[PDB]
Write a protein that binds this ligand. Structure first.
Ligand SMILES: Nc1nc2c(ncn2[C@@H]2O[C@@H]3COP(=O)(O)O[C@H]3[C@H]2O)c(=O)[nH]1
Length: 1027
């Protein structure tokens, strides 16, 4: 008889939920309504059949607190965890104005209604509870509908976020007014109310934020332990509510709301495979919670609530339903002028959807169950549940069912022409693909006898949506609209390969859409700047905090110990330990208002004072008279002044603050660096986004500029577009380069994070390629792919700021120098560093090439015959003037203060002729040039296919230069030779004796290349072999 009878009810409710969700899958009525009917049926039979009553009693009569403690954390957290937080923040003010202030008016008006209309003679407190529970909305259905039909970019999240905040605040108001109705306290002190307000409203979010930032800290330090990650998430979610609500008397719901939002924002710290599990897991838990609440409501509403329902109650139900409907619309319209100025605004049709889509749900019902249990035999409990359930039913029966048609009437359900065209094209391409497979299968000997009628009928994919200037402007608009489409595609292809973060993709696509809507409007670079524009607050904080710990002024073993890190670390650790005595002794004294402990801990304070005294002794003997120079030491001398002056002695009570203050304050020296790190983190986030948007736009323009050549007919239009794109690209590449100069360390951090991530991604691909070809066992491959996963998670713990390498390091890591230590020594011992001021010219067109240059600082603009570009740290200039002894091809101007490593041409010839091993210096230098020339050519040839610039760069990377001497002629293999690029010199076609210009992609029709040994120019050829 000790079996947990709650098991059958919980499991049975799951089966009934499955049945309802299955049968009413295509019908309009939401399944939750069916669950309520089933619960009512269970209730009526339970009144007659005692056996079932014994199986429903333990859940139907659930204690009220346990209801809140278990279900609300799931419902609230799941709602928060499922939000599109980025869009939520971009409209946070718009949500808050409507969610918080709108809630107050909506509930109070409802409370006034409930006091005046209803004959229950409720007072204001009960009426406010009524209004609070009536203002909680669960639009899960409406947001789901909008996600498919469109306008989900803003509206779906506004209603979802508004519902989240409204539910969060409703529980707060309900918690406040419940205590004044069922647990009244007479004290009613005016001052305490302010304190009480701060705890529920202000402390809650802070508690949630603290727990969230602790949680994500550990989650980022867990590798390959998915179970631990999931368990940590669960325990953090449940302890946040429990500790906050019970131990701290702090608003649990708000703490969980912040915790859910913060964790959702920090999803990168969760392993990708655990993230997808958690989303489905929390969804499942919320689904279970919803079903239980509806079934419980159905059971109890029939058992003890409908027994005491009068005729007028039904009348008031309809009136109340109408009132809450008009009240929501009035509130939305009343704030409409404000919402127009703050955020995205509200169109009249969008407002109607918000007004009509305000469905009530479980959160409202759960609170009603609490009143029913708490009210006991009072009619308040029954009529609270009656109206809550009734309004829930009506909103589910009417609002939830007609919203689909209303969205059509307002014309919001219409699918745009581009979507229809894309879907039709996709369906047709899939349809064609199946036909190709069908022909292939019919030729198979094994499968030749299959029933093809059934196969074709059962695998069909169906479309679910089924020269005059006056004339000249039409051509312009078509090109503009078509180019904007190519840009949108270009961003998407980048996202698939991981070159672009999702936020940058969304920003770029949104900007493209905004441009398309307006007439004669292209994507505005001056509008893109809002991404990589670092607001001054964070740089100011960084500089100010760095100033506070500028130890440059401070800059026989006592001196050595004074400057050893272990000394400071140990003493700071002692001080943080010394917090415990400080709290303990004074807490004991407060409790005392025995003395044995007090006397004992006063001695320990002397011990800690002695520790600090020996610290000071070491510091002074290390630095001598110059110890007092630093303000920090002055404070640490003042603390020991207090020690000496007050160790001897309101004589007792005055000592606590003196002991506390200085000791607890002198920890800030160890805190300031952490705040510097945090501020770097904030700058690192914004800067990282800036590079993505800027880099994405630059690559998008570069790619599209070679697709628009074939797409637009009118030449004058072609010139027009290629000019705007060039201006925008130069603007971005210049502005983006400057950010590096402003924040060198953070820029290096960002650039290293991308570099590693790109390496690991392609490292992951080869494993799949090896596994895909079967060359590696599945278990062995999975073992390797784990190491990649942990490495990519260690990436997100990398320091936000990395000190930039000194110039000597740059020489080591150059492509055509890395690896050969002897060569690096030769160059490093001959390269001379130079400095330049703003606007100074390093080189000029036609001027004789004197020596190479490597940029170690600053930014330089290039102007050559017209092509213009900007180059920055790490780039090399002067390579094609040394490799071929020819005048310079471009002018170089220093857009800012610049430093360069100058290697004289005379050195290069010596370096070239000295290092002649297989990885020849001249070979590598030419290879670097060749890839830079080849990429534009191959991109131009192959841009109209699915080839992104990264792939072409990788494709060329596999190539190599041909010696061209041991084989004076190059013969064009097709099987193992994919493409051939000429980089220098000229070649003669054997079958035509035609000459081909130096920078050209050898056409496939050429079968053999014949070369010459004239000393004027050594021809150079680049070849990339096939798989
Ligand atoms: N013209 C041109 N020069 C480049 C480019 N990238 C780097 N450079 C350097 O600009 C230098 C100017 O002409 P040089 O012959 O001195 O050698 C050139 C290259 O080393 C580029 O993309 N185009």
């Amino acid at each position: 008889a000790h079996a947990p009878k709650v098991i059958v009810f919980i499991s049975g409710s799951c089966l009934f939920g499955a049945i309802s969700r299955s049968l009413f899958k295509k019908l309009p009525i939401p399944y939750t309504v069916v669950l309520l009917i089933l619960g009512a049926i269970l209730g009526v039979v339970a009144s007659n059949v005692p056996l079932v009553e014994e199986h429903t009693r333990d859940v139907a009569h659930m204690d009220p607190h346990v209801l809140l403690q278990i279900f609300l954390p799931v419902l609230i957290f799941e709602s928060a965890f499922a939000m599109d937080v980025h869009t939520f923040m971009r409209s946070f003010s718009q949500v808050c104005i409507l969610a918080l202030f709108g809630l107050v008016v909506a509930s109070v008006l409802t409370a006034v209604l409930a006091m005046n209309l209803f004959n229950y003679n409720w007072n204001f407190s009960e009426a406010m509870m009524f209004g609070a529970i009536m203002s909680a909305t669960d639009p899960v259905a409406v947001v789901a509908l909008l996600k498919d039909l469109g306008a989900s970019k803003q509206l779906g999240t506004i209603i979802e976020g508004e519902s989240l905040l409204n539910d969060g605040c409703a529980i707060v108001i309900f918690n406040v007014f419940m205590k004044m109705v069922f647990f009244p306290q007479l004290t009613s002190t005016v001052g305490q109310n302010v304190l009480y307000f701060l705890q529920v409203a202000v402390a809650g979010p802070l508690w949630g934020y603290a727990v969230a930032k602790v949680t994500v800290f550990f989650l980022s330090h867990i590798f390959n332990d998915a179970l631990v990650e999931i368990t940590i998430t669960l325990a953090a979610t449940y302890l946040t509510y429990y500790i906050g609500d019970i131990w701290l008397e702090v608003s649990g719901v708000l703490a969980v709301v912040v915790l859910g939002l913060i964790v959702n924002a920090e999803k990168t710290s969760i392993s990708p495979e655990v993230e997808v599990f958690l989303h489905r897991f929390w969804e499942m838990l919320a689904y279970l919670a919803n079903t239980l609440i509806f079934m419980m409501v159905g059971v109890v509403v029939t058992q003890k609530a409908l027994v005491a329902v009068d005729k007028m109650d039904w009348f008031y139900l309809i009136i109340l339903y109408l009132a809450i409907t008009i009240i929501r619309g009035m509130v939305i319209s009343l704030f409409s002028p404000i919402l127009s100025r703050i955020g995205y605004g509200l169109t009249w049709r969008n407002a109607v959807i918000m007004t009509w889509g305000g469905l009530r749900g479980a959160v409202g019902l759960a609170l009603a169950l609490v009143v029913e249990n708490l009210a006991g035999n009072d009619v308040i409990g029954s009529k609270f549940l009656f109206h809550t359930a009734g309004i829930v039913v009506l909103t589910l029966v009417i609002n939830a069912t007609t919203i689909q048609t209303l969205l059509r009437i307002l014309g919001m359900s219409d699918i745009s022409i581009p979507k229809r065209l894309a879907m039709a094209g996709a369906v047709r391409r899939i349809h064609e693909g199946q036909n190709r497979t069908l022909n292939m299968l019919k030729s198979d000997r094994f499968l030749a006898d299959a029933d093809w009628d059934i196969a074709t009928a059962a695998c069909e994919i169906s479309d679910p949506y089924s020269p005059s200037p006056r004339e000249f402007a039409d051509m312009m608009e078509e090109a503009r609209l078509r180019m904007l489409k190519a840009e949108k595609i270009s961003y998407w292809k980048q996202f698939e390969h991981g070159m672009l973060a999702r936020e940058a993709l969304r920003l770029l696509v949104q900007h493209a859409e905004v441009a398309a809507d307006e007439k004669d409007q292209f994507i505005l670079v001056d509008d893109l700047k809002k991404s990589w524009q670092i607001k001054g607050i964070y740089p100011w904080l960084k500089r100010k905090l760095e100033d506070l710990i500028s130890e440059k002024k401070i800059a026989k073993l006592m001196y050595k110990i004074c400057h050893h890190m272990a000394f400071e670390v140990t003493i700071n650790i002692a001080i943080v330990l010394n917090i415990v005595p400080i709290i303990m002794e004074f807490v004991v004294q407060d409790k005392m208002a025995l003395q044995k402990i007090e006397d004992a801990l006063r001695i320990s304070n002397y011990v800690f004072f002695v520790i600090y005294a020996i610290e000071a002794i070491v510091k002074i003997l290390g630095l001598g008279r110059h110890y007092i120079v630093s303000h920090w030491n002055k404070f640490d001398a003042f603390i020991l002044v207090v020690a000496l002056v007050d160790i001897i002695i309101i004589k007792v009570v005055k000592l606590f603050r003196l002991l506390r203050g200085l000791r607890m304050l002198r920890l800030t020296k160890a805190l300031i660096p952490k705040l510097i790190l945090v501020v770097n983190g904030k700058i690192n986030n914004q800067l990282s986004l800036g590079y993505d948007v800027g880099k994405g736009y630059i690559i998008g323009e570069e790619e599209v500029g070679k697709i628009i050549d074939r797409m637009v007919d009118n030449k004058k239009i072609l010139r027009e577009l290629k000019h705007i794109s060039e201006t925008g690209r130069l603007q971005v590449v210049k502005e983006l380069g400057l950010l590096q100069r402003e924040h060198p360390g953070i820029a290096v951090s960002v650039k290293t994070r991308q570099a590693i991530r790109t390496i690991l991604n392609h490292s992951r691909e080869t494993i799949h390629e090896l596994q895909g070809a079967g060359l590696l066992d599945e278990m062995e491959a999975h073992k390797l792919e784990l190491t990649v996963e942990i490495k990519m998670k260690r990436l997100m713990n990398a320091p936000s700021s990395i000190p930039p390498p000194p110039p000597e390091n740059l020489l080591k890591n150059v492509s055509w120098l890395a690896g050969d230590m002897k060569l690096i020594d030769f160059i490093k011992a001959r390269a001379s560093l130079l400095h330049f001021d703003y606007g100074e010219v390093i080189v000029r067109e036609g001027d004789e090439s004197d020596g190479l240059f490597l940029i170690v600082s600053g930014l330089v603009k290039l102007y050559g015959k017209v092509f213009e570009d900007y180059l920055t740290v790490g780039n090399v200039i002067g390579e094609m003037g040394v490799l071929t002894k020819k005048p310079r091809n471009a002018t170089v101007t220093c857009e800012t203060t610049v430093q360069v490593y100058f290697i004289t041409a005379e050195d290069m010839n010596i370096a070239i002729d000295t290092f002649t091993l297989y990885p020849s210096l001249e070979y590598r230098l030419w290879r670097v040039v060749a890839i830079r020339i080849a990429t534009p050519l191959i991109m131009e040839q192959m841009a109209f296919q699915g080839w992104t610039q990264e792939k072409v760069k990788l494709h060329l990377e596999r190539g190599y230069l041909v010696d061209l001497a041991e084989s004076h002629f190059q013969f064009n293999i097709d099987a193992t030779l994919e493409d051939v690029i000429l980089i220098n010199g000229t070649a003669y076609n054997a079958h035509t004796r035609e000459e081909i210009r130096s920078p050209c992609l050898i056409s496939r029709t050429v079968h053999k290349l014949t070369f010459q040994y004239t000393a004027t120019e050594e021809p150079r050829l680049f070849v990339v072999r096939n798989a």
